[PDB]
Amino acid sequence: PRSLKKGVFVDDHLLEKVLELNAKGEKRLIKTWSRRSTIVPEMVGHTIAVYNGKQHVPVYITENMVGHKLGEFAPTRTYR
Amino acid sequence: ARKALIEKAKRTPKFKVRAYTRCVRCGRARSVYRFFGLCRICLRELAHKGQLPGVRKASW
Amino acid sequence: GKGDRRTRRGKIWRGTYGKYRPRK
Amino acid sequence: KIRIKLRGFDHKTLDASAQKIVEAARRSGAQVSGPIPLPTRVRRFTVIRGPFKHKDSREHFELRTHNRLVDIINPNRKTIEQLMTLDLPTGVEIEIKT
Amino acid sequence: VRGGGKSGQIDAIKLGIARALVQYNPDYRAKLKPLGFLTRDARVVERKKYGKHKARRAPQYSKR
Amino acid sequence: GNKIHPIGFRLGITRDWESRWYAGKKQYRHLLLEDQRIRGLLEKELYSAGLARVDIERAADNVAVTVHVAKPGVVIGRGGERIRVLREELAKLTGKNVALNVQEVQNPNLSAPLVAQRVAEQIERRFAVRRAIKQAVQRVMESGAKGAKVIVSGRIGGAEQARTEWAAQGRVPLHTLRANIDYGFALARTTYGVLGVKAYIFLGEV
RNA sequence: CAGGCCUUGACAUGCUAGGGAACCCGGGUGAAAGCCUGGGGUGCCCCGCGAGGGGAGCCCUAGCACAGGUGCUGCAUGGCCGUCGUCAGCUCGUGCCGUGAGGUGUUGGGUUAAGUCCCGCAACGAGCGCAACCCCCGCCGUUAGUUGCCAGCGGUUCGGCCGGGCACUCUAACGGGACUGCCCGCGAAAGCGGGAGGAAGGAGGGGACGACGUCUGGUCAGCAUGGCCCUUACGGCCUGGGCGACACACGUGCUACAAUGCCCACUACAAAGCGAUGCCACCCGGCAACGGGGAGCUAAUCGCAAAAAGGUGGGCCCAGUUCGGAUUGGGGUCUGCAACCCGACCCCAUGAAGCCGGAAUCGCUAGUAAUCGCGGAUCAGCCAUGCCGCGGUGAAUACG
Numbered sequence: 002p003r004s005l006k007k008g009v010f011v012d013d014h015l016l017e018k019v020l021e022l023n024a025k026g027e028k029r030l031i032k033t034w035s036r037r038s039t040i041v042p043e044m045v046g047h048t049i050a051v052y053n054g055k056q057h058v059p060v061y062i063t064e065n066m067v068g069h070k071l072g073e074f075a076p077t078r079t080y081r
Numbered sequence: 082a083r084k085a086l087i088e089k090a091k092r093t094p095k096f097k098v099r100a101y102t103r104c105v106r107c108g109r110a111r112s113v114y115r116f117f118g119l120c121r122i123c124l125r126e127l128a129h130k131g132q133l134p135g136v137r138k139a140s141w
Numbered sequence: 142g143k144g145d146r147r148t149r150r151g152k153i154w155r156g157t158y159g160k161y162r163p164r165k
Numbered sequence: 166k167i168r169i170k171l172r173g174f175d176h177k178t179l180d181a182s183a184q185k186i187v188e189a190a191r192r193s194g195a196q197v198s199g200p201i202p203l204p205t206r207v208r209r210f211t212v213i214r215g216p217f218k219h220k221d222s223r224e225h226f227e228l229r230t231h232n233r234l235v236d237i238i239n240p241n242r243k244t245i246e247q248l249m250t251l252d253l254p255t256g257v258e259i260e261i262k263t
Numbered sequence: 264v265r266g267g268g269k270s271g272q273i274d275a276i277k278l279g280i281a282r283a284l285v286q287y288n289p290d291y292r293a294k295l296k297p298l299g300f301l302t303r304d305a306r307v308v309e310r311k312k313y314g315k316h317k318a319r320r321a322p323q324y325s326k327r
Numbered sequence: 328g329n330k331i332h333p334i335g336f337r338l339g340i341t342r343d344w345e346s347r348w349y350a351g352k353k354q355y356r357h358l359l360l361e362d363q364r365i366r367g368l369l370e371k372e373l374y375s376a377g378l379a380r381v382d383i384e385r386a387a388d389n390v391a392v393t394v395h396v397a398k399p400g401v402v403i404g405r406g407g408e409r410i411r412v413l414r415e416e417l418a419k420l421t422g423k424n425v426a427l428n429v430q431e432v433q434n435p436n437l438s439a440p441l442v443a444q445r446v447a448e449q450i451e452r453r454f455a456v457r458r459a460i461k462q463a464v465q466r467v468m469e470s471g472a473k474g475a476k477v478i479v480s481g482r483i484g485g486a487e488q489a490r491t492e493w494a495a496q497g498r499v500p501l502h503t504l505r506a507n508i509d510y511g512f513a514l515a516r517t518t519y520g521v522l523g524v525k526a527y528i529f530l531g532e533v
Numbered sequence: 534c535a536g537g538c539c540u541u542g543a544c545a546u547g548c549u550a551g552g553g554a555a556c557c558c559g560g561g562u563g564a565a566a567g568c569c570u571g572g573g574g575u576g577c578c579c580c581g582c583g584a585g586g587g588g589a590g591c592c593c594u595a596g597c598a599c600a601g602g603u604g605c606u607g608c609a610u611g612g613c614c615g616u617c618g619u620c621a622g623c624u625c626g627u628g629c630c631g632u633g634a635g636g637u638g639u640u641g642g643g644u645u646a647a648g649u650c651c652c653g654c655a656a657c658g659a660g661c662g663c664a665a666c667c668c669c670c671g672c673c674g675u676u677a678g679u680u681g682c683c684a685g686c687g688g689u690u691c692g693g694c695c696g697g698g699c700a701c702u703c704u705a706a707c708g709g710g711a712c713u714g715c716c717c718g719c720g721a722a723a724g725c726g727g728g729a730g731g732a733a734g735g736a737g738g739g740g741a742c743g744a745c746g747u748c749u750g751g752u753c754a755g756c757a758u759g760g761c762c763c764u765u766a767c768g769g770c771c772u773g774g775g776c777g778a779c780a781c782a783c784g785u786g787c788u789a790c791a792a793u794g795c796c797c798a799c800u801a802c803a804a805a806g807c808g809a810u811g812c813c814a815c816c817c818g819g820c821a822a823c824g825g826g827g828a829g830c831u832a833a834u835c836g837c838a839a840a841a842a843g844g845u846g847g848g849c850c851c852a853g854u855u856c857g858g859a860u861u862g863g864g865g866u867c868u869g870c871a872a873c874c875c876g877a878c879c880c881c882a883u884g885a886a887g888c889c890g891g892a893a894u895c896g897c898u899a900g901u902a903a904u905c906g907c908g909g910a911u912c913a914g915c916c917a918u919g920c921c922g923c924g925g926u927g928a929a930u931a932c933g
């Protein structure tokens with residue numbers, strides 16, 4: 002039962018940094034702190050290193066994991 | 082209540098959802114009333130002194 | 142009971158409105 | 166038709182002061198609509214008595230805002246003489262509406 | 264009738280009726296008093312105190 | 328750790344507020360931070376004058392600020408050289424064309440805050456505590472009064488273990504509302520920490 | 534906590550110096566901080582015809598005096614609070630008794646909620662406490678009618694809507710009233726037990742009030758403060774994370790396990806409060822949360838606001854059920870820069886435990902318990918089932 006509204010949020014830090022990598026083919030890795038940003042299509046086939054709060058975790062973004070947010074793939078806590 | 086945090090006054094939050102009352106008298110940031118700008122403690126003190134017009138000891 | 146979101150009481154207790162408890 | 170509300174914290178001043186406006190017209194105006202009470206708006210403040218913990222103590226404080234009406238029907242022109250600058254209260258506020 | 268609840272009112276009505284019924288004929292007090300309909304029930308919702316869940320009902324303390 | 332403030336406990340009765348004025352939920356706080364800041368400067372300044380009370384009245388941008396002092400001299404100054412500085416220094420903080428009286432305390436030995444300050448001073452002056460207390464009560468108990476009492480906190484004479492010395496005379500029925508007990512607290516900074524002096528002076532009755 | 538950064542600072546008072554005044558708009562890299570940089574801009578004093586020169590305020594660099602620490606010590610401390618405990622007790626003055634610590638008073642008999650009062654007494658009196666003066670509730674009056682009503686009577690757009698009246702209700706100021714005063718019985722008194730009259734009867738209910746002191750009680754993270762300790766950092770900025778973890782255990786609670794009950798209709802009766810950049814009537818879109826538009830409020834005048842339990846009618850027929858609503862898929866609305874971690878709120882689908890709880894253990898003596906709903910502080914929103922108040926309905930029992 003998730004939600005947000007009409008305007009799908011994404012931080013332009015990497016947006017105008019992810020598409021900017023497209024107008025040149027592709028790239029490899031992107032160091033980010035903004036896990037607040039919603040994963041959109043122009044990312045599919047990329048590798049975004051998200052931040053735990055300690056380190057940057059590589060995250061090969063895929064087709065299905067679109068509607069989700071970067072943070073959902075960067076587990077914060079460490080357990081048994 | 083480190084001076085560095087009594088900077089709250091900024092009003093230059095960059096995002097208004099960062100603003101936060103904070104007692105004007107003791108810097109208190111945890112039980113600050115609106116109508117006084119004073120925390121629950123400071124309010125008790127000055128109230129006793131009578132430096133808060135009208136504010137009397139309620140009973141009933 | 143006061144804990145069933147979809148009942149008259151559910152809404153009242155939770156102090157909300159909706160299909161199961163319209164605003165007059 | 167002179168409506169003048171009287172709001173204050175002190176029911177004695179806002180009361181005497183209120184009966185000041187009443188006579189400063191009973192010598193130059195309609196019998197006036199007399200001094201009307203009007204419910205008081207109490208504001209309560211409840212705080213844990215001491216600092217740190219002890220959440221079961223607390224002390225209760227209230228700010229009682231008393232009110233009044235007065236109201237001088239018959240816009241007497243001779244009344245504003247006695248009711249111009251012949252006041253004395255210190256914690257009272259006054260609203261004038263015709 | 265106004266204020267309160269229908270059962271409170273029922274008792275209020277009980278007063279007026281006997282209070283008016285007395286003004287009508289003061290010789291009626293002598294028969295009403297023995298059953299005190301002339302008395303005003305002072306029992307009123309007792310205030311809620313702090314520290315207590317509701318006036319008298321106190322919180323529950325664990326393995327003291 | 329009990330006992331309510333004697334003043335706060337007697338506001339509606341034998342004892343009136345030190346700030347009389349109505350305000351709305353939009354200005355009350357402002358007319359307070361300021362109203363308080365007034366007491367802030369006046370306290371640091373008119374110290375030597377020995378300021379007992381600092382009433383303050385307000386209206387449409389008006390201000391009373393009646394300052395009660397034992398020695399009004401230091402207040403006013405040379406002819407009027409000072410009561411002018413501290414009024415221009417005052418109205419500077421708050422552009423409200425503020426008045427500024429200077430009442431005189433008839434017998435400062437019935438002014439609890441003063442009596443407290445007195446004892447407080449003597450303590451910073453390495454004096455003997457018990458004496459000052461006994462004296463204070465006497466001075467106050469002699470200048471008329473139906474009762475009096477003084478309480479110095481702890482760490483007496485720099486003594487490792489804090490204590491609490493007091494002594495008093497006449498009556499000081501803190502439980503009776505219809506009394507009138509000027510209360511006055513005075514701190515006392517030292518080389519070995521703070522001390523707290525408290526003063527009570529049972530003046531009238533009904 | 535990790536990482537990127539400032540280091541005379543985010544904030545005080547000052548200082549000697551190269552320099553440009555102030556303060557306005559820019560651009561690079563940036564996660565943001567920062568850091569590098571571009572123009573706009575030459576006001577104010579005393580000189581000088583002028584170029585310009587030296588000063589004021591301000592800011593800027595480099596070096597100072599110093600800022601800053603929610604760093605340690607609540608046994609170095611102030612202040613405030615908790616606690617025994619609203620328990621009825623703790624003391625003093627003078628006298629008297631003891632070599633003395635100390636005693637007497639305060640013990641004793643009656644009595645009381647009470648060191649409350651009476652009677653006794655080498656004690657006579659006092660303080661601090663009890664009580665009483667303060668608040669709220671219960672009856673009546675006086676003052677006061679843009680809130681009350683045909684109480685009356687006159688017009689109904691049948692709405693106290695009109696007229697106009699304050700009498701009622703109420704609102705809120707001020708007073709009246711209760712004193713064991715009156716009657717009988719007991720007593721020596723104080724004061725019991727009964728009766729009358731009264732709204733109210735013997736502290737009429739409920740508050741605020743908590744003595745000398747005791748826990749080396751609590752708080753250095755509210756604040757204040759002595760002493761230690763750090764100063765390119767234990768100080769400061771920021772982005773992100775964590776305070777929300779989960780094999781487990783406990784406290785306080787919420788919702789239940791159902792028929793005296795649960796649904797859906799329709800209907801009736803409260804009090805307190807709150808409402809500018811906020812309550813939001815009404816109308817329209819949507820199942821709805823909510824969205825549009827939009828009247829009124831500056832608030833006894835408008836709004837929050839439906840009170841709910843109750844009542845009338847209908848359904849369910851004893852089933853894990855039309856009980857219970859956990860969990861989990863979906864699809865949405867909002868606030869907010871932003872709801873992954875980690876927000877409520879709708880709507881569809883899911884429909885878990887739970888048939889009243891071992892040993893133990895808690896509350897409450899009357900408008901109390903139990904039960905029902907309403908408001909507020911804080912607050913963008915909210916994780917409030919918390920807390921502080923509010924008013925409906927309204928018991929059981931106390932031999933001892």
Ligand SMILES: [K+]
Pocket residue numbers: none
């Ligand atoms: K129930």
Ligand SMILES: [K+]
Pocket residue numbers: 608749
């Ligand atoms: K201690």
Ligand SMILES: [K+]
Pocket residue numbers: 885886
């Ligand atoms: K289960």
Ligand SMILES: [Mg+2]
Pocket residue numbers: 008009010
């Ligand atoms: Mg958005």
Ligand SMILES: [Mg+2]
Pocket residue numbers: 082083084
């Ligand atoms: Mg500090």
Ligand SMILES: [Mg+2]
Pocket residue numbers: 098100101
């Ligand atoms: Mg906030």
Ligand SMILES: [Mg+2]
Pocket residue numbers: 101102103110111112113
């Ligand atoms: Mg705050």
Ligand SMILES: [Mg+2]
Pocket residue numbers: 142145148
């Ligand atoms: Mg159900």
Ligand SMILES: [Mg+2]
Pocket residue numbers: 308
């Ligand atoms: Mg109740």
Ligand SMILES: [Mg+2]
Pocket residue numbers: 331332333336500501502
């Ligand atoms: Mg007192």
Ligand SMILES: [Mg+2]
Pocket residue numbers: 581
């Ligand atoms: Mg020139």
Ligand SMILES: [Mg+2]
Pocket residue numbers: 607
């Ligand atoms: Mg301690």
Ligand SMILES: [Mg+2]
Pocket residue numbers: none
């Ligand atoms: Mg302490």
Ligand SMILES: [Mg+2]
Pocket residue numbers: none
């Ligand atoms: Mg500790």
Ligand SMILES: [Mg+2]
Pocket residue numbers: none
């Ligand atoms: Mg003696």
Ligand SMILES: [Mg+2]
Pocket residue numbers: 631
């Ligand atoms: Mg002997």
